[PDB]
Amino acid sequence: QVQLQESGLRLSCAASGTIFRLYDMGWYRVASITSGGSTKYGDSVKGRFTISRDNAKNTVYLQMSSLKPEDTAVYYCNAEYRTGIWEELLDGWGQGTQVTV
Amino acid sequence: AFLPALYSLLFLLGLLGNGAVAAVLLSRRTALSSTDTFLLHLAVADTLLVLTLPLWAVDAAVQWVFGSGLCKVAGALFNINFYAGALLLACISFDRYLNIVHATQLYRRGPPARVTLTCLAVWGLCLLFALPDFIFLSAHHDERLNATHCQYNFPQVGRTALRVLQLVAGFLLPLLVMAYCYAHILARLKSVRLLSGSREKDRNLRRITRLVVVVVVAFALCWTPYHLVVLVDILMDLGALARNCGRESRVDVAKSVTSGLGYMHCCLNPLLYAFVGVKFRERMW
Ligand SMILES: CCCCCCCC/C=C/CCCCCCCC(=O)OC[C@H](COP(=O)(O)OCC[N+](C)(C)C)OC(=O)CCCCCCC/C=C/CCCCCCCC
Ligand SMILES: CCOc1ccc(-n2c([C@@H](C)N(Cc3cccnc3)C(=O)Cc3ccc(OC(F)(F)F)cc3)nc3ncccc3c2=O)cc1
Ligand SMILES: CCCCCCCCCCCCCC(=O)OC[C@@H](O)COP(=O)(O)OCC[N+](C)(C)C
Ligand SMILES: CC(C)CCC[C@@H](C)[C@H]1CC[C@H]2[C@@H]3CC=C4C[C@@H](O)CC[C@]4(C)[C@H]3CC[C@]12C
Numbered sequence: 001q002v003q004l005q006e007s008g009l010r011l012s013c014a015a016s017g018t019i020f021r022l023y024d025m026g027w028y029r030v031a032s033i034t035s036g037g038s039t040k041y042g043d044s045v046k047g048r049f050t051i052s053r054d055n056a057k058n059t060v061y062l063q064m065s066s067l068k069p070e071d072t073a074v075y076y077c078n079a080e081y082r083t084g085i086w087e088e089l090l091d092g093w094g095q096g097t098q099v100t101v
Numbered sequence: 102a103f104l105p106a107l108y109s110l111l112f113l114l115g116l117l118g119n120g121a122v123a124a125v126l127l128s129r130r131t132a133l134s135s136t137d138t139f140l141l142h143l144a145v146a147d148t149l150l151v152l153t154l155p156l157w158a159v160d161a162a163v164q165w166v167f168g169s170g171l172c173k174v175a176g177a178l179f180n181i182n183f184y185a186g187a188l189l190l191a192c193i194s195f196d197r198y199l200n201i202v203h204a205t206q207l208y209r210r211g212p213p214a215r216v217t218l219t220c221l222a223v224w225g226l227c228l229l230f231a232l233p234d235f236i237f238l239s240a241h242h243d244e245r246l247n248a249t250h251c252q253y254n255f256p257q258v259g260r261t262a263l264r265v266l267q268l269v270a271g272f273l274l275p276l277l278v279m280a281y282c283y284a285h286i287l288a289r290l291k292s293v294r295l296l297s298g299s300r301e302k303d304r305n306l307r308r309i310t311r312l313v314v315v316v317v318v319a320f321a322l323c324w325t326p327y328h329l330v331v332l333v334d335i336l337m338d339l340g341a342l343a344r345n346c347g348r349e350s351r352v353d354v355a356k357s358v359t360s361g362l363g364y365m366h367c368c369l370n371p372l373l374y375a376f377v378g379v380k381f382r383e384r385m386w
Binding site: 023035080086087088 | 300
């Protein structure tokens with residue numbers, strides 16, 4: 001299979017292995033960016049956060065500003081990928097990250 | 102006596118394989134899919150061709166003591182095999198192209214009569230390309246060769262026309278349809294997050310397309326060299342390149358070997374179907 005290693009106040013999630021293509025990425029506890037660049041957020045988020053994707057290096061980023069105590073949780077990165085042109089689309093999770101304030 | 106032994110071995114292997122495939126396919130009748138019907142018709146054509154191998158095994162040792170109707174039938178079957186294979190493969194490729202690209206299903210929501218009548222149409226259109234073989238191909242008896250080999254009688258002027266017809270139609274037209282359909286399938290399949298609207302149907306469609314493309318590749322690889330040799334013969338007859346005996350004694354053995362490959366494909370098909378399609382053996386035994 002393939003791996004998904006996260007980072008530590010900027011979140012960077014990377015993927016490596018035998019991947020034919022990456023399709024979707026995002027963060028969970030809320031923010032998901034597709035392969036074409038379209039970004040989606042929750043209905044309760046009025047542009048507080050921002051998500052950017054770097055398809056060349058297969059990395060997804062999450063920018064967080066004006067942090068609040070209610071955001072103290074554990075965040076996991078998710079990705080969708082296909083290991084071959086004739087194979088099935090399947091998704092994998094990451095280990096997770098801990099935010100300590 | 103190597104050739105009779107080889108012909109008998111191929112006859113046995115092809116008969117067993119194609120009989121097993123046809124029996125397991127007809128076991129679950131009235132529930133086949135379009136690809137299943139097309140593959141069944143390919144199996145029927147292959148077993149119908151390989152059913153003539155003992156005649157050539159006898160001809161390899163003793164002369165052609167069979168008459169003339171058998172000769173006409175054998176030649177017609179040899180031509181019909183590679184006509185029907187190409188045309189049915191083109192039909193299945195067009196079906197796959199439509200399903201992948203336009204998200205339209207002709208043989209699924211429509212009656213099974215829709216694919217039954219196109220199979221009948223391709224069978225008739227293949228018979229109407231081998232009618233000239235029925236008109237010709239009598240059993241001869243030449244001097245310096247005390248034998249009754251099978252050959253052609255019609256004038257050399259008509260040989261070029263028939264060869265051009267066979268080559269042009271049954272090689273170029275299916276090849277163009279193949280190239281267009283498969284280029285579009287690859288373009289619309291290498292960049293799409295999810296075909297159809299779910300995931301199980303997506304992977305099923307990918308698997309079926311893989312099986313179809315491997316079958317098409319096997320058929321093309323087995324049958325292309327004979328058409329190249331016929332093309333070389335056509336060009337050397339017109340005058341593009343010389344008719345030197347050193348260029349004829351070579352195309353003779355080339356024709357022999359390429360026809361042998363075309364015969365071997367008829368027994369190569371079912372084991373390829375079983376090995377790649379592991380699920381086929383699961384429902385077989
Ligand atoms: C440019 C297109 C615009 C319209 C073109 C109009 C016609 C142009 C004339 C074509 C000449 C150029 C040929 C290349 C064109 C690109 C399309 C292509 O390249 O396609 C064509 C191939 C070959 O045509 P044909 O063999 O049907 O000849 C038919 C002969 N007759 C009838 C005896 C069977 O058709 C195939 O199916 C190839 C499929 C395999 C290649 C992709 C494989 C992708 C997956 C990789 C691994 C797959 C593993 C399983 C496959 C087994 C190992 C390969
Ligand atoms: C495995 C079976 O292989 C065959 C079977 C039949 C023929 N076949 C032949 C035989 C006699 N034919 C000549 C020929 C004519 C037109 C097209 N192809 C071949 C051969 O070269 C036989 C042969 C096969 C393999 C050989 O290997 C080698 F290694 F020994 F070289 C040698 C000879 N005649 C025909 N006539 C009229 C109509 C149909 C045929 C018809 O089909 C050719 C192949
Ligand atoms: C309902 C009446 C359909 C009768 C059959 C129509 C023609 C079928 C034979 C055409 C063969 C032409 C050679 C070739 O390579 O064809 C490649 C494609 O055109 C094959 O088309 P098909 O999928 O058989 O066409 C489907 C016909 N429909 C659309 C009327 C259902
Ligand atoms: C020169 C001659 C021998 C060429 C072949 C002619 C005969 C044998 C062919 C032509 C039409 C063919 C039929 C066309 C369609 C079908 C329906 C299919 O579900 C089973 C096979 C079956 C029933 C075929 C059997 C073989 C057949 C009858």
